[PDB]
Design a protein around this ligand. Sequence first.
Ligand SMILES: [Ca+2]
Ligand SMILES: [Cl-]
Lengths: 129, 51
Amino acid sequence: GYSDRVRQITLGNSTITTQEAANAVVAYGEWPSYLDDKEANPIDAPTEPDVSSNRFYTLDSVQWKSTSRGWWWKLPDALKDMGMFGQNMYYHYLGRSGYTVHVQCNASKFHQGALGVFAIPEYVMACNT
Amino acid sequence: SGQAVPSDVIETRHVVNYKTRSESTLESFFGRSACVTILEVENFNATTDAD
Ligand SMILES: [Ca+2]
Ligand SMILES: [Cl-]
């Protein structure tokens, strides 16, 4: 019954379903976690907003055309205006976060195309001068 | 002097401090060869008291 193609993800008040997945990646084989006392740095009691902020935010959709060359976002920049996550981010000097990234693109059995979806640590890009 | 620490006046998390004051011991603070003077000497055929 259970399938690599069919998945549910629930975080806070938000759920995603997919019926045509291909497993899921856990970057570098490591699930996100809270910061341990033995690795901590700032000494103030942290804010852990939990379900207010740790939930699926859907960005504006983009259009894939035959002429599209691709798309980029940065994190946490892409979520800076997203509900209570954005408020917690901007009210504090310091923040850390893991992410579930869910990229959605359906077509038909008669369409063709392939998107590479990459999560890049420190994605530094070239300037235009 | 004032004695209060952050846990006295704010809510604090537990932070394990592994850092040491190794480099501010007197031995560490003074553990450098410092230039204290520049002397001058010469070698030539001296014909005057000054030379
Ligand atoms: Ca206290
Ligand atoms: Cl949209």
